[PDB]
Design a protein around this ligand. Structure first.
Ligand SMILES: CN(CCO)c1ncc(Cl)cc1F
Ligand SMILES: [Zn+2]
Ligand SMILES: [Zn+2]
Ligand SMILES: [Zn+2]
Length: 459
């Protein structure tokens, strides 16, 4: 019990309007066969085209919604919709494309999945609300066989060329014409009542339905993400490194020690209220303050209501000292807050589109994050960039151009000439900070926060 058995049952009711007469008793084995594929009793690391929920969840970065609509079945033109927003029209002979045969349409499919997936995943998982035309259309652009490696690298193959009779991964697939060894999962096998739109719209206002293929494909992946990452949350599942995950996580630790350390030095709060992750530690262990912790798991669905977090009767006085919300998403921060809030709208490889304007940020773990709302920060201001150190000016061990910055808050710069050590640290910390910002995290602070207050911490 790791892979989906081909002898598992498949509920065919969803199928029976595109495919009138379909047996009620049906396995994956008979379905895969019906879709026109011979598995060839093969023990070569691809037991089933179809996969478990848990396998799909481990492979979320691979998810592409797929939907087909009878545009007028061998007879008639098909509309191919993907959760990239692409619509291709195949003939037998937002983006909407004109009617073209399978031999060109399949080239476009490889180009499309390869660009989308090459920096996310080693595979594709077509996410379905299966009614029949999507399953029967796959023979026109899919080939299955034993697991293979790229003809130019050691990445597993995801594409095949009939021109060259060779195999490529997503990176090396240019001019390839077939999707090789795809995975797929039918959402309609998870026990839903009524149609897609009805269930999607229970959870999501952001994706409308223009009655076109791409719209259903997006709605399908949305509902899938809702079920697997919003309503259900599995924080145990790890995920491969595919980008700057380790630099971003480190940057985030540095910035947090910096900002909170300086917040305490500037306004000398007697108590810090640390609201969020129950695993969180004192980011400034040295600081004078009463450090009080308050457990709140990352809300995946709707942002926490400050009313429900604080009131219902703690120092209880959360208006005493400062409230630290480090990736704790609430509706409206109090004015005495330091806030780190992930911006769901950022374009990166770590950040997958989500449900109801939210986003799925995958970095070691998967965290569905509520839609960024600018109105949450009305009592606060954007935190300005700055570097602060009280460490001795002293090189040790980093080639130089004399550092001039107003935002380098150090004994040296007060004395008008930044020492080389604090100039190395400064340009390191600025890089970290830039990393974190571009990665999508935003920083906000109580309005009275003024970096001018930090200079007098040397005298
Ligand atoms: C935001 N973030 C990284 C999420 O990818 C993070 N923030 C603070 C600490 Cl202490 C550690 C972290 F990893
Ligand atoms: Zn390759
Ligand atoms: Zn949606
Ligand atoms: Zn110095």
């Amino acid at each position: 019990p790791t892979h989906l058995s081909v002898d598992t049952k498949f509920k065919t009711e969803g199928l029976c309007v595109d495919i009138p007469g379909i047996p009620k008793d049906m396995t994956y084995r008979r379905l895969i066969s019906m879709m026109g594929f011979k598995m060839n009793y093969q023990v070569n690391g691809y037991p089933n085209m179809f996969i478990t929920r848990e396998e799909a969840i481990r492979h979320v970065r691979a998810w592409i919604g797929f939907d087909v609509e009878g545009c007028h079945g061998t007879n008639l033109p098909l509309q191919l919709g993907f959760s990239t927003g692409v619509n291709l029209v195949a003939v037998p002979t937002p983006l909407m494309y004109k009617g073209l045969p399978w031999n060109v349409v399949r080239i476009k499919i490889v180009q499309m999945l390869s660009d989308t997936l090459k920096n996310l995943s080693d595979r594709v998982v077509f996410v379905l609300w299966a009614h029949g035309f999507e399953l029967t259309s796959m023979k026109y652009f899919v080939k299955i066989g034993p697991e293979r490696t790229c003809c130019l690298c050691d990445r597993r193959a995801t594409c095949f060329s009939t021109a060259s009779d060779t195999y490529a991964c997503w990176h090396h697939s240019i001019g390839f014409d077939y999707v090789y060894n795809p995975f797929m999962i039918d959402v309609q096998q998870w026990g839903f009542t009524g149609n897609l739109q009805s269930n999607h719209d229970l959870y999501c206002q952001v994706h409308g339905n223009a009655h076109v293929a791409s719209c259903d494909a997006i709605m399908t992946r949305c509902l899938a993400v809702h079920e697997c990452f919003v309503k259900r949350v599995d924080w145990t599942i790890e995920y491969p490194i595919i980008g700057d995950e380790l630099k971003i996580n480190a940057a985030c630790r540095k910035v947090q020690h910096m900002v909170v350390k300086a917040a305490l030095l500037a306004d000398k709060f007697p108590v810090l209220h640390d609201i969020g992750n129950p695993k969180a530690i004192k980011c400034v262990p040295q600081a004078d303050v009463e450090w009080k912790f308050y457990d709140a798991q990352p809300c995946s669905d709707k942002a926490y209501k400050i009313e429900e977090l604080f009131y219902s009767y703690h120092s209880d006085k959360f208006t005493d000292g400062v409230c630290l919300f480090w990736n704790c998403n609430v509706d409206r921060y109090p004015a005495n807050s330091i806030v780190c809030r992930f911006d769901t709208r950022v374009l990166s490889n770590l950040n997958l589109p989500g449900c109801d304007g939210g986003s799925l940020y995958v970095n070691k773990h998967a965290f569905h994050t509520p839609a960024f709302d600018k109105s949450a920060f009305v009592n606060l201001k954007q935190l300005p960039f700055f570097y602060y150190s009280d460490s001795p000016c002293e090189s040790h061990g980093i080639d130089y151009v004399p550092l001039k910055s107003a935002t380098c808050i150090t004994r040296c710069n007060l004395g008008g000439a930044v020492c080389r050590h604090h100039a190395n640290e400064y340009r390191l910390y600025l890089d970290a900070y830039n990393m974190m910002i571009s990665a999508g995290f935003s920083l906000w602070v109580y309005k009275q926060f003024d970096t001018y207050n930090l200079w007098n911490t040397f005298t």
